[PDB]
Write a protein that binds this ligand. Structure first.
Ligand code: CLA
Ligand code: CLA
Ligand code: CLA
Ligand code: CLA
Ligand code: CLA
Ligand code: CLA
Ligand code: CLA
Ligand code: CLA
Ligand SMILES: CC1=C(/C=C/C(C)=C/C=C/C(C)=C\C=C\C=C(C)\C=C\C=C(C)\C=C\C2=C(C)CCCC2(C)C)C(C)(C)CCC1
Ligand SMILES: CC1=C(C/C=C(\C)CCC[C@H](C)CCC[C@H](C)CCCC(C)C)C(=O)c2ccccc2C1=O
Ligand code: SF4
Ligand code: SF4
Ligand code: SF4
Lengths: 742, 80, 154, 159, 33, 95, 143
């Protein structure tokens, strides 16, 4: 059934098409009559569904494009590991990681920018990075710079291999459509073979290399004194001196006597109190169990043999009573459309990035991550933003499916039809609950603000005036703190210490994630988060559902996914397109993730992070001013924005001065974006035609006719400059704030 | 409602009306062009103002021309 | 001594800026050994700062009460190094850019599809023109006299 | 049972369990908003009584003087004020929507297809009777909620 | 009484004059001749 | 005919076609007791003239509002209690 | 006086499980634009109110919401399925106004029998300025 259907030499390797730009499209492969052409050359560059009509060439194009992306990421990791090897203080950071700033970038002394090379620590002048690569490397048992250079060279090798792979799998031997459509084998392999064997091999590294090395690094051993990792593979006596279960080898394994493996495959949940990260002993067992699970999960789908679930046979089996035929047809609209799959995988990968952000602060998995408050904050914020962007792109590509790849005649689905038929009910109830949440989450902030301004602090919604305690979250918190016991024995402690009954993991002078107390401010801000998420889903789901038709435009699909409008008629029908809906959902994702990372930064700096002296008195970075000031907007303006932006603006003449520079610059780029979002094309075309008169007066009339940006392009430029500016403002503000007071 | 007007520069290419989604326009015979036809706008009451007609008029500036005017329930394109 | 500004060679606050920056860079210098790369780079930046301040002193820059060089643009012969000589240095390059670009657009104007030469820049043509803007202040003047600079409406 | 409204698929609604069911349709059909046959005055009385209690609820315990001794009295006073305003806006609604003597704009048909009598609530005098009932019932429900908060304070929650 | 006149006029103006004005203007909007 | 097999355009019965239906408008008779109904009728017929109802509502509500705000003391609203505190001297003396 | 209206009878409607983009109260007090078409086979088409409908073999009938809905549907029909269509306008009083060809021919073929209106016998720049028609009902373009 499944096979390796692949055809040779379909496309010629030649620069002939490089010389002819815009070759991929018909209207673009004839010349730039205008300047918009170049914007259409980049816009449609990766719109392979519009270049061709057959799915075979599209699948080959995106396959080799994924290979290019993997080449890029291998080259990026090459850069990171190399810069760690040569331009870093990692060899010194291992000695005193609680006081040396992790730095992996040095600037060139030319124009005074050598101030950026600051006193990170370790006898090294550079930039205090906030990526957490140093923490990984301590978790990977690197203990050198040679290993990092070798890793960089190997990553460069794999980058070149992936580049050759894309070239081979497009130009030399490109797979045909029967190969991609065999999703059964693809899932069987990516579950068991990528995620199963990948987690298994990382468990092997974690058992053989990370665990024995971190058993010494945490035990006051200098990295120069540690035995090399391969010495544990060659000499098992040195490995057994700390974990004697290796003296028996795999006889405990194959005889199912796993009870004599707990020296290195543990379940003692919680954070290693010597470094603040999770127990690597638990992470080895984790990735091992995940290997078992993905290995049994990747033998689920029939590929060639009589066993396995045909995914058609799973989907067609589910047919609801008043839900109609049910999931029949979905295997044909997911295997004959890349955009549907792209949307699904984007949505899940984005929510997974967010879950990563959430589980990487509350269960610090790397050593000296929780105490590197810059790394923790930056990683949470990063992955939150990536998740929001991926979800918003999932919306865009659901819409693109609905416009292009949706065919109720051939590739019919029942549930999608049922969703389209009461789409007004969906959007009406979402448009209601967004207003309800908006009111009962932000009008509460307004109420607190007014009551505090009228001198009525006894009337706010605070932890002192009117109790809005998260009773449900408090119950989950208290039962997860008292989870070690009847419900989860053999764990020795809670799976995390972000719950009230937990304890404080004092690492050096720092505090590293004691319990998080949930009060009225957490209720208010969590409902603000639900609000912003619900409005984003309103906008995006509305764009997806009404991508094809509305009461306003019933032929919206014929106009396309990415179109500005259908004229000033009907009172005006700007931004009816799903592209414009996702362009608005970008702003709302921005507001959502911005208030999310603000909640994170403030709740952490006030209720979690800080410094605990040897007497035991923990003093937080702000001073616990979240539950009292995060109930009103003036606190976010005063105690969070105004106050914590006293280290990014005062950082002029310091090592953190590029942060204030990009603070002002990202401010600027955001505001500059407002020139695009607010304005319209017609003014700029008329202005351009005036200055084109000024040029034609001097025989400087360019043949590529100067055209103002297309409307959808003005909206794209506006949203990208707006997001870049707000996000770089926040990035600079967070990084300078959290590196300065640290 | 809206006031659609067709000027004498029309070449009679029938794109104004083949693009018009509300049957506002219709081609009539004429003697001013090689195609011997010109567009007319009888059903301006059904005109929403989307200007798909004049986004498809291939002339110096335009021949068909939509003027936004008194908006009624059908020019505003309301199903309610 | 104009505009109430003292020169920087005889300013107090300018020397104070010098001393303050040097003490700032020396405070960041007592954390490394005096022979390693960070201390060597810090000493190089220190000499850079000291020579910078002394060069701003010896050029006759005018340092105000805040102790920073205030450039004079009015046209004083002593302060043509502030604006007028670099202004001519600018305008010479800027007109070079404009003139080679204009002569390039005029060169491709007699092409079948000129726009493809604005995308795919004809590097031989431009390179033969790229030095033709060296003489722009005279070629442009003649094109203005001959009538070839400004186009005619028809 | 999500088949369309009256089996008519091109009308913008559906007979889902929430809209058209033996329990929820019965409940929405035997309450004073949809008693098209009885005169609108009793309907408005019932409506106003219910909403007067519902408004006195979140004025005594939630308000500017909830913790004071003037909580119940002044909260009921604010609820009566909101009730007067609601009758006010109902009144301008009845004046603006239908003038003096036109027939009812309500549907004269039902789901079963019977040419039923039109709902005289939607007329001018009918809506006026409904507003009068709403005002009377609402002030009465406000004062009765005040009475129950006065004489029967102990079973209800104070907090 | 001069200290009691704001207490009469502010609740008068800022609540009744909106009642009168917005009501009469909604009636003027929803009118037909 | 509206009841034919998938026919929803009875041109005579345009109510069934356009969707004119009392979806829950039960025509069932008065479920109330007659005596309390007559009681409410006689005691709410004053509120039968919508114009007189509106005039009464606006004027009496404004009167009651002015009465409450004028007769209420500072115990129920701090704005009428007054300062009951010495005034702070502003910046730069008082200016 | 060459093409009479068709006066749509009680034809069957397409098979459709019902949606929310259908007829609201606009039909109950204003027109609602019935469309009629004639299918060769029982095939499936996208409805302009969202969702998929199954047209019946033979004549069909759909009362959707407004003119643009039925004309978008009919254009999709004529282009994708190659099928003759005609749609109407059904006021609540009872009258049924015939509208789409109004000549038996679609409004692209310049068939004689239609009078030209909205027709300014001039180039578009030769319209008078507004000051020339100030304080007059004619705005700029009706002379
Ligand atoms: C280097 C050798 C080489 C050569 C000569 C060609 C030649 C060709 N390829 Mg192939 N290709 C190659 C390598 C090569 N390819 C590799 C390594 C891959 C895997 C990624 C592919 C994948 C591939 C696909 C999937 C497709 C082609 C196509 C084409 C044709 C048109 C390409 C074009 O004009 O765009 C030229 C484009 C560029 C020069 C730039 C592309 C971007 C590169 C890959 C990465 C950019 C990295 C950069 C750092 C990121 C930006 C960030 C920056 C701002 C810092 C042409 C026959 C197309 C074709 O034939 O379809 C009709 C097509 O669909 N190629
Ligand atoms: C713009 C894209 C982008 C960028 C620049 C980064 C950048 C970073 N990430 Mg993030 N990340 C992203 C997207 C991105 N991430 C997304 C979309 C995901 C969701 C899968 C993650 C999940 C993720 C995790 C879980 C972690 C990072 C970490 C890091 C940092 C170290 C880089 C590294 O490779 O360490 C080495 C990488 C790892 C140790 C990650 C292990 C592999 C993960 C758990 C799963 C394997 C991927 C799988 C095959 C594909 C998905 C399967 C599908 C079923 C979902 C760096 C700040 C690490 C960090 O902060 O360390 C301090 C870290 O722990 N990221
Ligand atoms: C029972 C074997 C086992 C063990 C010891 C671990 C151990 C760990 N897991 Mg993993 N995990 C496992 C199985 C396991 N995992 C399976 C089968 C799943 C799939 C549901 C997961 C899904 C999972 C997620 C999604 C996350 C972890 C995380 C963690 C860490 C949190 C600290 C802790 O006490 O974990 C206690 C672990 C549990 C209570 C999970 C048990 C799940 C049961 C066996 C599934 C039935 C730790 C390294 C967290 C992490 O790495 O954050 C940095 C995290 O976010 N685990
Ligand atoms: C798995 C991830 C993924 C994949 C494979 C795709 C793939 C695609 N997307 Mg989707 N998309 C994604 C994520 C993804 N996108 C995300 C995360 C979002 C949310 C914003 C979107 C939102 C989105 C929209 C709204 C649209 C697409 C479109 C497209 C298609 C064409 C895009 C193109 O040619 O632009 C080629 C590349 C460019 C034009 C460059 C973009 C320039 C960016 C914005 C630069 C600035 C960002 C940078 C990080 C900041 C540094 C600035 C510095 C350089 C100074 C293609 C099928 C389009 C489509 O299908 O059209 C029909 C379309 O309309 N996508
Ligand atoms: C602070 C600026 C701001 C505010 C207040 C709003 C407010 C709103 N937006 Mg908008 N929006 C904004 C900026 C803003 N937006 C920007 C910059 C963009 C660009 C992308 C958008 C894009 C946008 C879209 C695309 C969508 C919204 C939606 C919404 C609504 C969700 C909240 C709601 O109704 O709950 C209640 C109202 C609030 C929370 C607003 C604050 C009001 C306070 C609490 C009380 C007001 C006083 C009270 C009534 C007394 C009146 C006194 C009398 C004298 C008048 C609401 C209309 C969504 C929507 O309409 O569906 C729900 C939606 O889909 N907005
Ligand atoms: C503060 C809000 C509020 C509250 C608590 C009530 C409460 C009530 N109303 Mg009133 N009503 C309100 C606002 C409110 N109304 C408004 C704004 C209008 C104008 C449209 C009306 C018009 C009205 C009429 C005409 C009637 C009532 C009636 C009723 C009573 C029962 C029917 C009912 O509400 O359930 C029915 C609920 C719905 C139809 C809403 C369904 C929507 C979803 C499924 C529920 C979601 C709830 C969830 C928690 C969120 C009950 C005392 C009846 C009455 O007074 O009987 C004595 C009656 O006949 N209401
Ligand atoms: C903010 C919300 C809120 C608050 C604070 C109150 C407060 C109160 N309610 Mg109300 N109530 C509310 C919402 C609210 N209600 C809603 C939404 C309903 C359903 C429509 C009711 C229905 C209700 C009834 C039926 C009764 C109360 C009564 C009461 C009182 C005693 C309850 C024991 C107290 C003053 C009781 C009372 O007599 O009040 C004095 C009473 O009998 N409430
Ligand atoms: C446009 C000019 C103007 C403005 C902006 C104000 C503004 C104000 N006046 Mg004054 N007032 C004015 C002219 C003005 N007054 C004149 C000309 C008179 C004499 C007829 C008064 C007599 C007056 C009294 C007696 C009172 C106010 C009060 C007020 C306040 C509440 C509004 C109100 O009830 O006013 C009512 C004003 C009128 C009906 C006169 C309109 C002409 C507000 C600060 C009240 C106050 O003191 O609050 C602090 C109050 O009790 N006003
Ligand atoms: C001395 C000085 C000053 C003043 C000055 C002035 C006041 C001047 C003026 C001037 C003027 C009043 C001028 C005018 C001009 C005009 C014109 C009209 C021109 C034209 C030109 C052209 C046309 C050119 C062109 C070109 C070139 C040559 C370059 C490049 C290319 C091109 C083509 C662009 C001050 C004290 C401040 C400072 C110091 C210096
Ligand atoms: C400013 C603006 C424009 C005009 C923006 C223009 C066209 C961008 C300016 C030109 C760019 C920068 C290209 C010029 C640079 C070229 C690559 C040429 C190189 C020349 C040297 C710099 C090398 C719009 O078209 C628009 C449309 C809809 C809503 C808002 C707006 C809007 O706000
Ligand atoms: S303003 Fe722009 S987007 Fe809106 S209708 Fe006009 S052209 Fe279209
Ligand atoms: S689009 Fe313009 S030129 Fe073509 S037929 Fe219509 S009016 Fe004439
Ligand atoms: S504006 Fe739209 S509806 Fe009016 S004539 Fe032009 S295309 Fe037809």
């Amino acid at each position: 059934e499944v096979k390796i259907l692949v055809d040779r030499d379909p496309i010629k390797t030649s620069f002939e098409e490089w010389a002819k730009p815009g070759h991929f499209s018909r209207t673009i492969a004839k010349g730039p009559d205008t300047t918009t052409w170049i914007w259409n050359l980049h816009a449609d560059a990766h719109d392979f569904d519009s270049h061709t009509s057959d799915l075979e060439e599209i699948s080959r194009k995106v396959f080799s494009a994924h290979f290019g992306q993997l080449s890029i990421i291998f080259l990026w990791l090459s850069g990171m590991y190399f810069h760690g090897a040569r331009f870093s203080n990692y060899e010194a950071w291992l000695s005193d990681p609680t006081h040396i700033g992790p730095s992996a970038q040095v600037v060139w002394p030319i124009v005074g920018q050598e101030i950026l090379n600051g006193d990170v620590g370790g006898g090294f002048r550079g930039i205090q990075i906030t990526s957490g690569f140093f923490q990984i490397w301590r978790a990977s048992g690197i203990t050198s710079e040679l290993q990092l250079y070798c890793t960089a060279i190997g990553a460069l090798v794999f980058a070149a291999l992936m580049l050759f792979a894309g070239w081979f799998h497009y130009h030399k031997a490109a797979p045909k459509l029967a190969w991609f459509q065999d999703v059964e084998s693809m899932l069987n392999h990516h579950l068991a073979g990528l995620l199963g064997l990948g987690s298994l091999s990382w468990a092997g590294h974690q058992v053989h290399v990370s665990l024995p090395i971190n058993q010494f690094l945490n035990a006051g051993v200098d990295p120069k004194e540690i035995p090399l990792p391969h010495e544990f593979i060659l000499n098992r006596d040195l490995l057994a001196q700390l974990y004697p279960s290796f003296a028996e080898g795999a006889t405990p394994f194959f005889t199912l006597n796993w009870s004599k493996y707990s020296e290195f495959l543990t379940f003692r949940g919680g954070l290693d109190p010597v470094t603040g990260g999770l127990w690597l002993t638990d992470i080895a067992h984790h990735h091992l169990a995940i290997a078992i699970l993905f290995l049994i999960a990747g033998h689920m789908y029939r590929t060639n043999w009589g066993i396995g679930h045909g995914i058609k046979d799973i989907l067609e089996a589910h047919k609801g009573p008043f839900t109609g035929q049910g999931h029949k047809g979905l295997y044909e609209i997911l295997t004959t459309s890349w955009h549907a799959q792209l949307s699904l995988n984007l949505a899940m990968l984005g929510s997974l990035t967010i879950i990563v952000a959430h589980h990487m602060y509350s269960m610090p998995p790397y050593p000296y991550l929780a105490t590197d408050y810059a790394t923790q904050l930056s990683l949470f914020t990063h992955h939150m933003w990536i998740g929001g962007f991926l979800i918003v792109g999932a919306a865009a590509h659901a819409a693109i499916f609905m416009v292009r790849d949706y065919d109720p005649t051939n590739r019919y689905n029942d549930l999608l039809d049922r969703v389209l038929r009461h789409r007004d009910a969906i959007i009406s109830h979402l448009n209601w609950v967004c207003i309800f949440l908006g009111f009962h989450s932000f009008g509460l902030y307004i109420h607190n603000d007014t009551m505090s301004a009228l001198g009525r602090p006894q009337d706010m919604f605070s932890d002192t005036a009117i109790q809005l305690q998260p009773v449900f979250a408090q119950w989950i918190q208290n039962t997860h703190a008292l989870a070690p016991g009847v419900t989860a024995p053999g764990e020795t402690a809670s799976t995390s210490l972000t719950w009230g009954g937990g304890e404080l993991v004092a690492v050096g002078g720092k505090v590293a994630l004691l319990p998080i107390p949930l009060g009225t401010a957490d209720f208010l801000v969590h409902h603000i988060h639900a609000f912003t998420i619900h409005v984003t889903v309103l906008i995006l789901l509305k764009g997806v559902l009404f991508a094809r038709s509305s009461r306003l435009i019933p032929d919206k699909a014929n106009l396309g996914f990415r179109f500005p409008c259908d004229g000033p008629g009907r009172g005006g029908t700007c931004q009816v397109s799903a592209w414009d809906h996702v362009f608005l959902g970008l702003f709302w994702m921005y507001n959502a993730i911005s208030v999310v990372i603000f909640h994170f930064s403030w709740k952490m700096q006030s209720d979690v992070w800080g410094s605990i002296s040897d007497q035991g008195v923990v003093t937080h970075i702000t001073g616990g001013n979240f539950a009292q000031s995060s109930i009103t907007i003036n606190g976010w303006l005063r105690d969070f924005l105004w106050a914590q932006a006293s280290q990014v603006i005062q950082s002029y003449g310091s090592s953190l001065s590029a942060y204030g520079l990009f603070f002002l610059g990202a401010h600027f780029v955001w505001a500059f974006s407002l020139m695009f979002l607010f304005s319209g094309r017609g003014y700029w075309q008329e202005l351009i035609e005036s200055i084109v008169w000024a040029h034609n007066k001097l025989k400087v009339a360019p043949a590529t006719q100067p055209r103002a940006l297309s409307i959808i392009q003005g909206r794209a430029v506006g949203v990208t400059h707006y997001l870049l500016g707000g996000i770089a403002t926040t990035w600079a503000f967070f990084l300078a704030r959290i590196i300065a007071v640290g | 409602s809206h006031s659609v007007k067709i000027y004498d520069t029309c070449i009679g290419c029938t794109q104004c009306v083949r693009a018009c989604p509300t049957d506002v326009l219709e081609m009539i015979p004429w003697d001013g062009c090689k195609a011997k036809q010109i567009a007319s706008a009888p059903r301006t009451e059904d005109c929403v103002g989307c200007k798909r007609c004049e986004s498809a008029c291939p002339t110096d500036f335009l021949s068909v021309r939509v003027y936004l005017w008194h908006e009624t329930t059908r020019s505003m394109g309301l199903a309610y | 001594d104009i505009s109430g500004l003292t020169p920087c060679k005889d300013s107090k606050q300018f020397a104070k800026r010098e001393k303050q920056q040097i003490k700032k860079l020396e405070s960041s210098l007592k954390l490394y050994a005096p022979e390693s790369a960070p201390a060597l780079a810090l000493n190089a930046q220190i000499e850079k700062t000291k020579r910078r301040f002394d060069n701003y002193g010896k050029y006759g820059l005018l340092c105000g009460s805040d102790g920073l060089p205030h450039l004079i643009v009015n046209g004083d012969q002593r302060h043509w190094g502030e604006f007028i000589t670099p202004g001519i240095l600018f305008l010479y390059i800027a007109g070079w850019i404009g003139w080679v670009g204009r002569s390039y657009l005029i060169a491709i104007s007699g092409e079948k599809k000129p726009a493809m030469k604005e995308i795919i820049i004809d590097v031989p043509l431009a390179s033969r023109i790229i030095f033709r803007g060296f003489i722009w202040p005279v070629a442009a003047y003649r094109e203005f006299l001959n009538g070839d600079l400004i186009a005619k409406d028809v | 049972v999500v088949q369309p409204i009256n089996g008519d698929p091109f009308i913008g609604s559906l007979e889902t369990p929430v809209t058209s069911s033996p329990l929820i349709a019965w409940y929405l059909s035997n309450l004073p908003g949809y008693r098209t046959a009885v005169n609108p005055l009793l309907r408005g009385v019932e409506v106003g009584l219910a909403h007067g209690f519902f408004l006195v609820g979140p004025f005594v315990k939630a308000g500017p003087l909830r913790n004071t001794a003037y909580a119940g009295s002044a909260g009921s006073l604010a609820a009566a004020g909101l009730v007067v305003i609601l009758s006010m806006c109902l009144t301008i609604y009845g004046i603006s929507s239908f003038k003096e003597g036109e027939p009812s704009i309500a549907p004269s048909l039902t789901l079963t297809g019977r040419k039923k009598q039109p709902d005289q609530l939607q007329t001018a005098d009918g809506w006026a009777k409904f507003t009068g009932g709403f005002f009377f019932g609402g002030i009465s429900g406000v004062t009765w909620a005040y009475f129950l908060l006065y004489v029967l304070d102990l079973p209800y929650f104070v907090k | 009484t001069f200290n009691n006149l704001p207490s009469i006029f502010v609740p008068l103006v800022g609540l009744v004059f909106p009642a009168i004005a917005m009501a009469s203007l909604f009636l003027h909007i929803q009118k037909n001749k | 005919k509206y009841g034919d097999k998938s026919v929803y355009f009875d041109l005579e019965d345009l109510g069934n076609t356009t969707g004119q239906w009392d979806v829950y408008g039960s025509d069932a008779p008065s479920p109330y007791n007659p005596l309390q109904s007559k009681f409410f009728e006689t005691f709410a017929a004053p509120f039968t003239k919508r114009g007189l109802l509106l005039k009464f509502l606006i004027l009496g509500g404004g009167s009651l509002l002015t009465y409450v705000s004028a007769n209420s003391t500072g115990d129920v609203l701090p704005i009428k209690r007054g300062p009951q505190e010495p005034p702070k001297l502003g910046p730069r003396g008082k200016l | 006086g060459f093409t009479p209206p068709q006066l749509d009878p009680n034809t069957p409607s397409p098979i459709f499980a019902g949606s929310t983009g259908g007829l609201l109260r606009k039909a109950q007090v204003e027109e609602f634009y019935v469309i009629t078409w004639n299918s060769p086979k029982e095939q499936i088409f996208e409805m302009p109110t969202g969702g998929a409908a199954i047209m019946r073999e033979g004549p069909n009938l759909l009362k959707l919401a407004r003119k643009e809905q039925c004309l978008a549907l009919g254009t999709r029909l004529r282009s994708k399925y190659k099928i003759t269509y005609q749609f109407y306008r059904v006021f609540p009083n009872g009258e049924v106004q015939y509208l789409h060809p109004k000549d038996g021919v679609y409004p692209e073929k310049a068939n004689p029998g239609r009078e030209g209106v909205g027709l300014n016998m001039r180039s578009i720049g030769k319209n008078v300025s507004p000051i020339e028609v100030k304080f007059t009902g004619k705005q700029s373009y009706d002379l």
